[PDB]
């Protein structure tokens, strides 16, 4: 379990191992790395804002 | 008073003239590009 | 602004506080408390004790409110704290329907009021809570969210027609 060789869960009073899996987490990367860069987009536009103001 | 304030709050309505300014420059844009 | 003192000033506002609490005028209840800033807070227990009463009525405390009702050594207040009695009667009769999955009868006798009344007939018949053996029994009800699936689908029809409508605009 610890080495991610295996997707299981143990029992002590029952001695039962149970296997379960749900792979896809593409939405997190999919939107988060957009947003992290668009932070830097708007921070680049900060300078143009300060130029038009003063 | 009746023929006094009516002209004033008619001339209040002249923001439509500035809307016509906006749309006139827009028509200028499209006509010149065409 | 001369304002000489009077006889029932410190509890006439308590009378109004009491019945305007018994009308559930909570916005009025908290805009009335403004004209006397520290009189309603630092002192005047027939303002502070009605709003400490309401401080107990904030969350859910039932019989501590009735202890505070069992001690007012001021004048009557009775014609409005009986309205407060009744607005607690239907408060238990409202919050009964929650996870009191079974309750023994005499604790409901303690909290509600009236040991073996015909008010137990009033609650057990006007309400549900089937008068079985020593127990108000809890029935079950469900929602299933079955059909909707469609009010989601048609409210999304509304919302995405709106998204497409605002993206749509052109004039």
């Amino acid at each position: 379990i610890l080495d991610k060789k295996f997707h299981g869960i143990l029992d002590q009073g029952e001695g039962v191992l149970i296997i379960f899996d749900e792979p896809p987490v593409d939405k997190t990367y999919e939107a988060a790395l957009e947003t992290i860069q668009n932070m830097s987009k708007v921070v680049d536009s900060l300078y143009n804002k300060a130029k038009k103001l003063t | 008073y009746l023929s006094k304030i009516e002209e004033l709050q008619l001339i209040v309505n002249d923001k439509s003239q500035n809307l016509r300014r906006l749309q006139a420059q827009r028509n200028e844009l499209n006509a010149k590009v065409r | 602004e001369q304002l000489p003192e009077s006889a029932y000033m410190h509890q006439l506002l308590g009378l109004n506080l009491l019945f305007l609490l018994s009308q559930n005028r909570v916005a009025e209840f908290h805009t009335e408390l403004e004209r006397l800033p520290a009189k309603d807070i630092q002192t005047n227990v027939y303002i502070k004790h009605p709003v400490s009463l309401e401080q107990y009525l904030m969350e859910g405390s039932y019989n501590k409110v009735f202890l505070a009702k069992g001690n007012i050594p001021a004048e009557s207040y009775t014609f409005f704290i009986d309205i407060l009695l009744d607005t607690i009667r239907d408060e238990i009769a409202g919050c009964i329907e929650k996870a009191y999955e079974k309750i023994l009868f005499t604790e409901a006798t303690r909290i509600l009021f009236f040991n073996t009344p015909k008010k137990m007939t009033d609650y057990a018949k006007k309400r549900g809570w089937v008068l079985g053996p020593n127990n108000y029994y809890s029935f079950a009800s469900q929602q299933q969210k079955p059909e909707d699936t469609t009010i989601p689908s048609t409210e999304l029809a509304k919302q995405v027609i709106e998204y497409a409508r605002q993206l749509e605009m052109i004039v």
């Binding site: 869960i9 029992d11 149970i18 379960f20 939107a31 988060a32 947003t35 708007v42 536009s45 | - | -």
Partner: protein
């Protein structure tokens, strides 16, 4: 001459913030201050240290020696414009102006750097000046003047592939990433640990090893962790040197759930009295706690405090309040029971963590663009 210059700011941190720790620091601060002819950077600490009873002559003779050393170069400039080399004036007194700036404040920096920067066409001197800016901006913790020429240096780096500046700025941006709460970047920048020259900021390569283990035990879970710090060898020999470094590694990889806070007690009490972790050690502890609790709770679903009391430690109520706060903190989802003595886990925690970070970044970005879009048109 800014190579021994880091221990100065080290002691600036180490003296004033612990109250009782105020004797050895001011001792060897004197032992470093009345030599090297230091004058400017300690007026604040002079108002933090003692009266320094005679400030009259003992420092004015020093700044007079500084004036002699200063205008011998400022009267060497006319002797060096006689034979114009590579502007031998500016090439001589660039590093001696950084000597003067090791004496002085950052004004000598901000004019001498940009002075001698446009002199050279050999970019190695430019790189040395950029190193000088990064170091003195780290000294005054000016975390914004340095991020300019980090990028402006990586432009001067990446005309190809090199040795020097690549590995150097790996160390530099590693220290900047460990300055802020940035840990996976700190591990990725401290990935190398092989060609990291025994330096003045790497005042011990062993301390560099302690830092790169003290962030790699947070950053990744286990999909390179054993391979770098356990299956590796070049790190393994020098972690085999110190006991305490190898201690927590083989503890946490062994899952000795009681010696953890012993190891963490030593590392944390050192972490208190160590710089560039001052807003950091608090979240560090709960980070290690949740990182241990993850690998504990992953294997079992039928577990409780009755398993905690013998394999983890004592104070069942402490386990209770700690896990209560950490679970109710939206972290490590698993549900606990009262006196029936049950700690059950939620077997996937990947439903709302899916939905989570996107709304949590869109909040800040929309809050940005609200105000900043309403900045224009008044």
């Amino acid at each position: 001459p800014k190579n021994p210059d880091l221990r100065i700011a080290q002691l600036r941190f180490l003296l004033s913030l612990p109250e009782h720790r105020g004797d050895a620091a001011v001792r060897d601060e004197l032992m470093a201050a009345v030599r090297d002819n230091n004058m400017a950077p300690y007026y604040e600490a002079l108002c933090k240290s003692l009266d320094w009873q005679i400030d009259v002559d003992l420092l004015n003779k020093m700044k007079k020696a500084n004036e002699d050393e200063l205008k011998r170069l400022d009267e060497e400039l006319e002797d060096a414009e006689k034979n114009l080399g590579e502007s031998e004036i500016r090439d001589a007194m660039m590093a001696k102006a950084e000597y003067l700036c090791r004496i002085g404040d950052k004004e000598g920096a901000l004019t001498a750097f940009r002075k001698t920067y446009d002199k050279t066409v050999a970019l190695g001197h430019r790189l040395d000046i950029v190193f000088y800016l990064l170091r003195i901006g780290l000294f005054y913790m000016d975390n914004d003047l340095i991020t300019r020429n980090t990028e402006k240096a990586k432009s001067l780096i990446e005309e190809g592939g090199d040795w020097d500046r690549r590995n150097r700025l790996k160390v530099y941006q590693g220290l900047y990433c460990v300055a802020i709460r940035d840990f996976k970047q700190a591990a990725e920048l401290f990935l190398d640990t092989v060609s990291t020259f025994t330096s003045y900021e790497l005042m011990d390569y062993k301390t560099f090893v302690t830092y790169t283990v003290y962030v790699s035990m947070i950053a990744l879970e286990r999909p390179d962790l054993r391979e770098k710090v356990i299956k590796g060898a070049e790190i393994l020999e020098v972690l085999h040197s110190l006991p305490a470094v190898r201690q927590y590694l083989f503890s946490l990889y062994e899952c000795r759930y009681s010696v953890f806070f012993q190891s963490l007690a030593v590392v944390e009490q050192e972490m208190k009295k160590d710089w560039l972790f001052a807003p950091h050690y608090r979240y560090y502890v709960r980070e290690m706690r949740i990182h241990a609790y993850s690998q504990l709770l992953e294997s079992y679903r039928s577990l409780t405090l009755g398993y905690m009391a013998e394999a983890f430690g004592v104070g069942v109520e402490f386990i209770d309040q700690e896990l209560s706060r950490f679970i109710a903190a939206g972290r490590l989802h698993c549900k606990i029971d009262k006196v029936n003595e049950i700690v059950e886990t939620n077997r996937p925690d990947s439903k709302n963590w899916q939905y989570q970070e996107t709304i949590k970044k869109g909040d800040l970005l929309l809050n940005r663009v609200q105000k900043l879009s309403r900045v224009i048109n008044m």
